[PDB]
Amino acid sequence: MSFPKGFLWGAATASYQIEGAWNEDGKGESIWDRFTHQKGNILYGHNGDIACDHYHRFEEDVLLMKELGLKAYRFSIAWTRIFPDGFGNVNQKGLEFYDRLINKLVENGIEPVITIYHWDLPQKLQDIGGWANSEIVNYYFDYAMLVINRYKDRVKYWITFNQPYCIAFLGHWHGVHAPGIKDFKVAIDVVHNIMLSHFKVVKAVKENNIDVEVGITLNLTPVYLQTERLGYKVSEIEREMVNLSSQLDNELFLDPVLKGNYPQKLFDYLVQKDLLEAQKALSMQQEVKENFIFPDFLGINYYTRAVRLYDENSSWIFPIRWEHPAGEYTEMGWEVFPQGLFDLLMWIKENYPQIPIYITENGAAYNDIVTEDGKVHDSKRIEYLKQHFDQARKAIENGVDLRGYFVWSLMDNLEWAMGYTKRFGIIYVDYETQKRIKKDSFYFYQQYIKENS
Numbered sequence: 001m002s003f004p005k006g007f008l009w010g011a012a013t014a015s016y017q018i019e020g021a022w023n024e025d026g027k028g029e030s031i032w033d034r035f036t037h038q039k040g041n042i043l044y045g046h047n048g049d050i051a052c053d054h055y056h057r058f059e060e061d062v063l064l065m066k067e068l069g070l071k072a073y074r075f076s077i078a079w080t081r082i083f084p085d086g087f088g089n090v091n092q093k094g095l096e097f098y099d100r101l102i103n104k105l106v107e108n109g110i111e112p113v114i115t116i117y118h119w120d121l122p123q124k125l126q127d128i129g130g131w132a133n134s135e136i137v138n139y140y141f142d143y144a145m146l147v148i149n150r151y152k153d154r155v156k157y158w159i160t161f162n163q164p165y166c167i168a169f170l171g172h173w174h175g176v177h178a179p180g181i182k183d184f185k186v187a188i189d190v191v192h193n194i195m196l197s198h199f200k201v202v203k204a205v206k207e208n209n210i211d212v213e214v215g216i217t218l219n220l221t222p223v224y225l226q227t228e229r230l231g232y233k234v235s236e237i238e239r240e241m242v243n244l245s246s247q248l249d250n251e252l253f254l255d256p257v258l259k260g261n262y263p264q265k266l267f268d269y270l271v272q273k274d275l276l277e278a279q280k281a282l283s284m285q286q287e288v289k290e291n292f293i294f295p296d297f298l299g300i301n302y303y304t305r306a307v308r309l310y311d312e313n314s315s316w317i318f319p320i321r322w323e324h325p326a327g328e329y330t331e332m333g334w335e336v337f338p339q340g341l342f343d344l345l346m347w348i349k350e351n352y353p354q355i356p357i358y359i360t361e362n363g364a365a366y367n368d369i370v371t372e373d374g375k376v377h378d379s380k381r382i383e384y385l386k387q388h389f390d391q392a393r394k395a396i397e398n399g400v401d402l403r404g405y406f407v408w409s410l411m412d413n414l415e416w417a418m419g420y421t422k423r424f425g426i427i428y429v430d431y432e433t434q435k436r437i438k439k440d441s442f443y444f445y446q447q448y449i450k451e452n453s
């Protein structure tokens with residue numbers, strides 16, 4: 001069973017994680033510039049001031065992509081490089097960088113896939129409440145339409161948002177991501193404003209007859225029951241409560257994007273527990289129904305699963321706990337579970353309308369060391385990729401409309417609050433010299449693309 005003709009074998013990055021040049025050429029301050037410049041937020045006080053210096057070295061990086069034989073390259077645009085203040089003055093030097101990057105990609109036969117928002121909100125917009133302020137929808141819209149209109153001739157695939165779960169909950173509930181806010185109700189407001197922002201862009205692309213594909217990227221976590229792993233009888237309350245908990249991860253974002261409503265079971269529970277105001281629940285349902293429009297593709301970020309069970313006295317917002325099955329784990333503490341990719345894809349196929357699917361991120365963090373001969377023998381990363389590739393092939397064989405696969409990541413980069421301590425690249429980056437070293441996984445992926453295209 002072969003991968004389809006034209007399958008987009010890719011690699012992915014995000015602007016804040018690789019670009020550096022955080023205050024060059026009139027670039028405004030982002031919430032991640034602010035967050036990493038405050039003590040106690042990032043391991044080892046790492047920041048994205050320099051990162052992989054991709055802003056200056058993009059030409060050499062594109063050459064590595066060509067050598068690799070990528071069909072596509074997924075990256076994000078830094079809003080603050082285009083509108084330093086979020087709205088108003090457009091920065092010509094910002095636009096010129098992405099002009100040069102995109103042209104270089106096109107010259108090398110690589111399909112650009114652009115994430116419009118990958119977490120780096122302008123701090124000036126955060127100053128007025130960021131994603132919690134419904135004015136953000138229009139500011140985002142103007143930014144998105146500017147870049148789409150400028151690049152639509154060279155860029156066919158656009159992703160409105162990457163991982164709304166993180167933007168909302170990690171950014172505004174747990175506060176482990178920028179902007180570091182800790183309020184569940186604010187986080188739900190953010191979810192809603194993201195959905196409206198997304199819908200507005202999809203609508204404008206259709207209504208203005210812009211010939212591009214617009215999607216959104218969600219991290220999805222397939223949830224499994226510890227009780228079933230153990231062979232016990234599953235109680236009704238357990239199944240119900242674990243289902244609720246997994247709706248927070250998955251359905252809360254899939255349902256509005258693909259069906260035009262929020263999951264009602266989740267909302268009923270959140271209102272009952274005074275985690276969501278009854279009025280807001282009704283308004284959110286109505287506004288999403290009014291503005292809903294089906295997208296052109298679904299982007300899925302997949303890394304691992306979760307195993308859960310009922311626990312009446314848990315400190316989580318649902319009475320559930322997590323369990324840790326035996327097996328292999330990455331430096332992130334994430335279970336290596338390729339089967340979860342297959343189960344997830346089949347579950348999307350069976351429970352949602354037909355839609356093309358791209359795996360916009362999948363990869364693994366291992367503690368790479370460079371040998372004396374200047375190599376990186378990341379055989380565990382290779383095994384991780386090989387097994388997930390195989391599950392993707394199996395999903396295709398079972399009728400999933402999978403159209404691409406982007407490895408996270410093209411190169412080692414700043415892993416947000418974990419700093420540079422987590423290496424996901426198929427290319428090693430020595431942060432002292434900015435040298436790029438092709439890992440063994442680079443050559444494995446190169447070969448894999450060659451024999452599956």
Ligand SMILES: OC[C@H]1O[C@@H](O)[C@H](O)[C@@H](O)[C@@H]1O
Binds near residue numbers: 361
């Ligand atoms: O946490 C590892 C990776 O998770 C993904 O879901 C995010 O989109 C990436 O930006 C991040 O580097």
